[model samples]
Target: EFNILLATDSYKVTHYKQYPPNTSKVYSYFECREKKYEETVFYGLQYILNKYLKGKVVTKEKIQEAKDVYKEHFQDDVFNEKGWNYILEKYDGHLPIEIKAVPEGFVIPRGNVLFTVENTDPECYWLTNWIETILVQSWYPITVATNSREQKKILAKYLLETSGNLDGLEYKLHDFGYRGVSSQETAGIGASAHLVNFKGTDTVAGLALIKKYYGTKDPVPGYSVPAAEHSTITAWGKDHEKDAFEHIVTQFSSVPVSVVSDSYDIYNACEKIWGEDLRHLIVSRSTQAPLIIRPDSGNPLDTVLKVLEILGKKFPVTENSKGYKLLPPYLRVIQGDGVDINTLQEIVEGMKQKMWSIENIAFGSGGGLLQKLTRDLLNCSFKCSYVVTNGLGINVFKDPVADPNKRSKKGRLSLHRTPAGNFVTLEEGKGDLEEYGQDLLHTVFKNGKVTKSYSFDEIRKNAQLN
Candidate 1:
């Protein structure tokens, strides 16, 4: 899976011979089209550059293995044997390409360049699109980051309106997408993408990734509170369900803990077991650390309100400055079921209608946050727009007669800020050379080296929703 030669689409192997005669270069850019959101959070390219595309990725062993596999797989002379040998011998098994991109965590409007790739050596032109398969996977983290930011906007708005400040906003949206993603690496990418907006996550792979790849000052960029799942709660027989609740609350008494409360009767567990039987234990904890109640099954909006109402009566309720009911510092609700952005909006609106402060609840998401997405969500595409032939430069593009919306930008592109401070993409080399001095797209990787790097702290600052 780490082999760069084998990491691309099968058709890409044959593309070397398909380019026009005397074609010396190809320039491509990745961007989101027909945007689901007006802006996208550009991310994960650094991870890709650091992990996959950097250093001497092309090895003699990898090339031979791909050649053998493609020979048997195709049963024809379709593999680019000469080209592979040329790169391996000439470039010392390092890819000769330059990648320029907007900084990670920087938000840019859809249809603008997120990144561009071009061959530094004219002979290695086909290498650009050959690596497109992996480069385009940047869509995953960008989508997840954008989704998290969108959710953050909603939470921020509600919190500002209800509590008059963004206290506890970082932990409001938690990542529970570990089991919901296609692979462990996916969990790392998607959940870490979520971390650009929030600091809370239960995805260990995400934490490990940032610890390994991102220059995080903290031990881990993403953090999680002690939380229990259904198995832990159900381990105690139904007769001792209250014992399960009491065991967890008393065990982690000094720190925040989340217990899934819907294994059996959720309403009874909230109103009787937690609210009455274990109420004193929770209230008398050494620290004011919350005993977060999680209702994992039911209509999210209605169930959240019901649980909050039951807990409100059992715990002392304070009215915030906005006249909304706030839960005690030691008591809060976390809804982890059936949560998407739309569902979250509905639940937040329900709380508002009932005069409950946004502070009373936090959210955890699984499939909705990670797996329920596609490249088409933002209509992402990477297309070649410019090329240089033998002593000639050409601006290339695609504008199909059928769908003008599919039309792509042409030529060497520059992302420039206007006088009003709005960013714009100038295509076909129309950009002013002086303005290009401060172009947003910086050369992050060139000829197998990561020339520029962003620490996790800098990325968080760029992504912070001020």
Candidate 2:
């Protein structure tokens, strides 16, 4: 399932010769103009290339298995022998797409290309024709990372206002999104995407992907702690909720820990058990970083304020450098229940009105963070911009009259950054970019191999600037 090689529809391989005749290359580009927030992070390219044809060849057995699995199902279509055998005989079972993309941590604006793809061997037009679906499907991680980065911006905004700097910005937006996603791969991909901007994660599968695709365990890609779920709290029964919280600090005192405060009554949990009873025990934990209380269900903005008010009354509030009320370094509240960019901003605004510092809360977004968004969020589309025919290159574009927003670009393209930081899309790969810097569209993948590769940290370093 980690392979985009086989992650395509049955019709992709079968629909042969649908493109223009004598077509040497079918060039296309990826970009996201539409955004609910701001900016896009170019990710998932390494995942796509490394898992597919980069530095590897398709096994004869896997090819035959795919052919056999679908061959028997088709009768009149004859199993697309021209297309299927084209891979086995002509291409030597290696992908024919030459992919030039921005590095994973780079930023793509509204009009620029995130990446460009074309069939290397012009005669093999459809050699990469099936790649449209696989590449377009990659919009998931891009969207996730984009959404995560936007959320980080929100946190940074409030953090600068209240905490004076983005000191622990990596831990601001936690990944409580694993179970909320569509599948295991969704969790892994979405979680890793979140890691592009933030370092917190509870999704175990996501951290695994960080190790798998990213560099290593030296500087951890993501971090998590012994955190409680509804099951862990409810299993102790409503009366024993105190026991659950006690057990968390008792068991995981050497490391960080978070306890869900809303299994029964969130208000009572905050005001009575956590505020009054467990205050001393939580404050006295010498080795614990901070005892985090998670409020999972309620009107998030009001609930966060209420929990903070309760904790504030119980603990001391210190005035930070920014003159905002900062909670003592021991107890903190994390709102993981209803979080997205919107809800998180609402919470920040509500708390700002309450004069609470951004350090008082960290958001753990679930479905809204990763899974709830759609491909249409960025208007993510991959269309053939240029194609070569009869050894001549021509520009092709869609000018949708009804919605000019749907207008596409033309010609073999190169994206360049001007000295003033403008993303210039040069048509037919020609432009006066000597005044600007070098073209960013370099080959990350070629016939059967990756020409360039980026470690996750390198990408993360670039992402931090965004």
Candidate 3:
């Protein structure tokens, strides 16, 4: 068995008619249409399975059978017969192989290597090279999503302690990473990753894929349920504050609204317009639901804190003639631009110093989470060590730097978490395929068939704990 990471739907670049620089050779084999479709379908499937069905139990025999079926159905010859002959001729007999890596939702660290795949045959090593782009593209989104969720959890803990409110849970953690990601598929995968942690996403396409793979329930008002919960719009050079506020009130009046307020002067807009008119709408119209004010420019922590103070003062406690409390807390703030784990921690710390309730703050993570972190930090790469050439087995894992960081541990490596909260690696000494009880790789597909199905919600649920 081998491990394959598929690209998410949003990673595709539909408008760009050609591959990026140095990617022509990869696309030369498959037609642009087939290549795009294959990436979309394959990654989409991976997201669904990883998100939904990963933890459920199925017999080993069934999984192997599925692998065989998938191989038969998704072989290179099948693509050739379906008018994708160029791909067949270019790669010769090399076909995209599918294998399950260590369960999909495992939370890996920034610099820890996860999974590796080698060519099944010596001649196919070059063919495996072609799969690198998709593999790398697929893995990064999950990592980013996992990290982003951790940041949110940290913020949530701080907010709960400081503000005595858990209301930020209701506000969506939108994935505004599309603008910064390398491709559409990356955006989709990034969205899926965010969803894995129960953080809502702004990518509409990504949300749809999650719903498609994971299933969905009808929207329940006022309660936090599993679903995509937010979106974003750019105001450009126009009167951003006015346009954005009006757009939010007009489109999403009853539900929670998060408006990006940095198209012009962020502080000015918040103090003058958004703080005045938008704050009124949030107070008057949706007293039950919270409205989020998003600042996508400037220092995210400072800007958000400034906005929160303005909001707190503007809506201070008022008493009626009978001395009853009036004006419920209606406004919340979300920081979108330049938000990372460190920045998020700083925001929480600053809020604590001011005695400002951080429950009023949420985050919209984009480039910092999705684009900045990647497999390079984890030292992850796919390499083929053993290949079958003319029925003679050739071992290629002769390199010395195969342990710790640069190379894969020869044979199967078991994933173990030390009681001290550190990850430990256990290498299998030597064994036949059947005796490899602790192999991290599993059969995801066999005989050209899908052995199982998983939902995006399931994956998202697992992300919450990890």
Candidate 4:
């Protein structure tokens, strides 16, 4: 836990103004800055409110820990020692702000407030402003969660058109993003952010984070089949390729198994070794299980179609109502290479051209899932909307001359849904929402305690709205 109140001028933040005489409060709001996506799914606030920000300012022991973090790495000389001391002595380290937030998985139209923050006590006006450093970084997971949801929409659109329903959508977008991230901490958090939208994952770090912080039960939050890598497959001499394919089903006959079939040659492994060599053994021995073929290199669309054609002649098919041929559950293919948002859409487009149902394939994305992303995708931001001075509310905002898009919202923000079901925001000085308009945000955290928490089932259902 980093000391947000240290190295930062608590007094400058506490004393946040020149024109203002006596500041009574500062009301801030966090919202996505663009209308890029029609709607954005809300997430990661539980991590901010109940997990990461937990125990930030509450005791002397917490202060001593924050002091070392301040003097050593943050600022050895100008470490804002007085501010840290004042926090420890005066407020006893607890942040004095009431956090009202939209439900963790609530979906809102772009430009609506996801949450609002205001100082609980009129006198402690600057208490929450210094915590902006920790607060603003929350954009990471919320953006990734929305990204994963959009990915689901891409898959859902295809599945609906192809298979006629969203069967297996949960297991379709598998997470392989652990090694590509900056750290295990990022992997855990980013991976879990992905879980907010889908259920398939291989990032153990992400699953662990969800279990520990979010209270997902054991054998919960994610699911994966037994699979093989190059090191394990190639170690069995390239000439002994049959041995590699034979073991996957032989060793794990009762459970789903995926093996890298293109260890040395893609065509030879699919057509010769798998089709001609072990076709009988696999169909007979792995009858009770599903063996998934994985190829890690080549153009994802072309390679997957090529592999499917080679395997289709040898394996039986079950046609769906849409008349697309689905490979029997005994065998299927997954594209783990060249997979991302653009590629995912393109691959589906290629399959549609060939009349292949989405049921014939699944996907695993590594760097694309979490590591290769930024704020521009969502343009999410946190900005001060209103600051009270001399017991008067002043709307604070920015209208940059160079970039009009940089303009932020103004005044004390509250999000609500109209009787007609459209979402909008109201400001303090500006009039509030109508009486019939239900407020979307509820008090989630007050001072040092979490006011409400949700289960994984509640959040997952909240996203699908079904």
Q: Which candidate number has the best TM-score?
A: 1
Regarding lDDT, does 1 or 4 come out ahead? Answer: 1
Task: Report, for every candidate in turn, its global Cα lDDT versus the true structure.
Answer: 0.89, 0.79, 0.49, 0.77
- Per-residue lDDT tens digits for candidate 3, residues 29-55, read 100111000111112336533442233
Instruction: Indicate which candidate wins on lDDT.
Output: 1
Model 3: lDDT to the true structure: 0.49
The per-residue C-alpha lDDT of model 2 at residue 421 equals 80
For model 4, which pairs clash? 57-93, 57-94
| Candidate 1 runs further than 4 Å off | 435-437
Alpha-carbon shift of residue 176 in model 2 (angstroms): 0.6
lDDT by residue (tens digit), candidate 2, 68-108: 66666654433444554566577677777788888788877
Candidate 4 local Cα displacement, residue 413, angstroms: 1.0
Segments of candidate 4 deviating more than 4 angstroms: 6-21, 56-82, 216-219, 285-288, 429-433
Report model 3's TM-score to 2 decimal places: 0.64
What's the TM-score of each model vs. the native?
0.97, 0.93, 0.64, 0.91
Candidate 1 backbone collisions, by pair: none
> Cα RMSD (Å) between model 4 and the true structure?
2.9
Instruction: Please list the residue runs of candidate 2 whose C-alpha ends up more than 4 Å from where it truly belongs after superposition.
Output: 1-6, 34-38, 55-75, 217-219, 432-435
